[PDB]
A paper describes a structure:
We obtained a 3D reconstruction of OCT3 (apo-state) at 3.2 Å resolution and completed the model by combining the experimentally determined structure with an in silico model generated by AlphaFold (detailed in Materials and Methods). The structure features a prominent, partially resolved density of the extended extracellular loop 1 or ectodomain (ECD), which is adjacent to the outward-open translocation pathway. The structure of OCT3 features various negatively charged residues lining the substrate translocation pathway: D155, E232, D382, E390, E451, E459 and D478. The outward-open state of the lipid-reconstituted OCT3 is surrounded by several lipid densities. This V-site may serve as an access pathway for hydrophobic molecules that diffuse into the OCT3 translocation pathway. In apo OCT3, this network is very dynamic, as R212 cannot establish all interactions simultaneously.
Organic cation transporters (OCTs) facilitate the translocation of catecholamines, drugs and xenobiotics across the plasma membrane in various tissues throughout the human body. Organic cation transporter 3 (OCT3, SLC22A3) was identified as a corticosterone-sensitive catecholamine transporter in 1998 and belongs to the SLC22 family of the major facilitator superfamily (MFS) of transporters. OCT3 plays a key role in low-affinity, high-capacity uptake of monoamines in most tissues including heart, brain and liver. The substrate binding site is located in the center of the transporter between the two domains, halfway through the membrane.
Residue numbers in the entry: 2 to 74, 88 to 99, 114 to 316, 328 to 534
Write the structure that this text describes.
């Protein structure tokens, strides 16, 4: 309780904590860049085709542009002039033959598809990048939680920032596909640590009050990164340029070092004490206990107390359900506006009003009610999209978008309440352990969607709606985490 009085004497919001807030929100923006920017990596080429050695030789000796070459001849099989022994075919009597390799591309924009030749039979492994990135997210969460709890928050934050920067530079200059995949897996490993660590530190540094502003505003910065990603993607077209621009700000964030102290409350576990008091004194620019050391956290110790176990299980299931429901709704949406950049910009922009509603609502009504309402709205939208007369009304897309907004609002509220729920020691371990489960949902979603859609078109939507509708009990079983600051050690289970 003296720590609460310590923050009362100096803290809450000052100039220092505001500057730290903006500085870490920058890292949130960069993590948002990393999480989605693959959709602008390897955008599908307008035309792709394969040519034989004779066709390539004659094309080079005549020097025509790829556009007319594709026009006269994307297809995965090509005619062969070798069998024949300005049109090459007089009457297309030459048979067509499938090609194992040698295909080229026509569009001038640079994509990972052009460099790594991910088309035809290799078009399978374009989503392999998705799976590997999400698996890297999962494993990086799982291990970096323990890494950041064993050491301090700031050291692991800085190390993860350096790792993200260097692995991104390596990926930008990957010579072959296996190197690209391995180092992008590693980038996903390190990328998960930065976001979780920055969220936990910015939650710890502020007191019990105005913590909801902290969480919701950093989520708004994540959404801002999503919104602004089309800007850089459109302005600089080259793949290498886009990845370089995404990854270099990690070094600038690595420049922090002495700017941001790790956490007073992290060190108040009688690990250091004197360093904590020094940090508090350094905080107080404007104005002039003892317990058993948890030390290394244990995964089994993460689930040992019935209330602790209940919180862990409900949080994990909510994460997984949100992931699968969001994937289903996004697949249902398709394309809006006829443009990729415009669609992405609109999708990002419409995310903000939900965040504003959350920011204005959490204090008055708590946190359980808006979260339950968001999940219920998502489930009802899923069911309504499933059952309606053949989609003869323009309300399919509106209902799907409304459900997506509801599930994103739930995604934002859960990421905060997850942070408050866990103890101080287990905080960065328990958090990102559930994000591991949402990453697992992300990897498993396409297979489940295809399998269920094989049986019936609207079965996945029905299942997702039921999963979302379970929230009525799922989140009602939570303790509302209102005005109780952040629980210390095993005092999480008092409620």
């Amino acid at each position: 309780p003296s720590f609460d009085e310590a923050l009362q004497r100096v803290g809450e919001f000052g100039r220092f904590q505001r500057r730290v807030f903006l500085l870490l929100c920058l890292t949130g923006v960069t993590f948002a860049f990393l999480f989605v920017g693959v959709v602008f990596l390897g955008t599908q080429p307008d035309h792709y085709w394969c040519r034989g050695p004779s066709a390539a030789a004659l094309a080079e000796r005549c020097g025509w542009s790829p556009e007319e070459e594709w026009n006269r001849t994307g297809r995965c099989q090509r005619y062969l002039l070798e069998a024949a022994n300005l049109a090459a075919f007089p009457n297309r009597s030459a048979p067509l033959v499938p090609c194992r390799g040698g295909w080229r591309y026509a569009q001038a924009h640079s994509t990972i598809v052009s460099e790594f030749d991910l088309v035809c039979v290799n078009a399978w492994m374009l989503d392999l990048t998705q799976a590997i990135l999400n698996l890297g997210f999962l494993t990086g969460a799982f291990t970096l939680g323990y890494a950041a709890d064993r050491y301090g928050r700031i050291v692991i934050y800085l190390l993860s920032c350096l790792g993200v920067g260097v692995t991104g530079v390596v990926v930008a200059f990957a010579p072959n596909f296996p190197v690209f995949v391995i180092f992008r897996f590693l980038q996903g490993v390190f990328g998960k640590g930065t976001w979780m660590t920055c969220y936990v530190i910015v939650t710890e540094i502020v007191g019990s009050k105005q913590r909801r502003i902290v969480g919701i505003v950093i989520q708004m910065f994540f959404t801002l990164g999503i919104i602004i990603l089309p800007g850089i993607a459109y302005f600089i077209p080259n793949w290498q340029g886009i990845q370089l621009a995404i990854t270099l700000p990690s070094f600038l964030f690595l420049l922090y070092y002495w700017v941001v102290p790790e956490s007073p409350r992290w060190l108040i576990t009688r690990k250091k004490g004197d360093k904590a008091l020094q940090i508090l004194r350094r905080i107080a620019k404007c104005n002039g206990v003892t317990d058993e050391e948890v030390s290394n956290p244990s995964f089994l110790d993460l689930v040992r107390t019935p209330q602790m176990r209940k919180c862990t299980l409900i949080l994990m299931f909510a994460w997984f359900t949100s992931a699968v429901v969001y994937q289903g709704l996004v697949m249902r949406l398709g394309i809006i506006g006829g443009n990729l950049y415009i669609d992405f910009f609109i999708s990002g922009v419409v995310e903000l009003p939900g965040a504003l509603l959350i920011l204005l609502t959490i204090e008055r009504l708590g946190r359980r009610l808006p979260f339950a309402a968001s999940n219920i709205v998502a489930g009802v939208a899923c069911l309504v999209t499933a059952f309606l007369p053949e989609g003869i009304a323009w309300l399919r897309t509106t209902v799907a978008t409304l459900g997506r907004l509801g599930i994103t609002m739930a995604f934002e509220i859960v990421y905060l309440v997850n942070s408050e729920l866990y103890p101080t020691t287990l905080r960065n371990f328990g958090v990102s352990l559930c994000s591991g489960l949402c990453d697992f949902g992300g990897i498993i979603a396409p297979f489940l969607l295809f399998r269920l859609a094989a049986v019936w078109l609207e079965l996945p939507l029905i299942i997702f709606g039921i999963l979302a509708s379970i929230c009525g009990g799922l989140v009602m079983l939570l303790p509302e985490t209102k005005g109780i600051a952040l629980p210390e050690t095993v005092d999480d289970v008092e409620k």
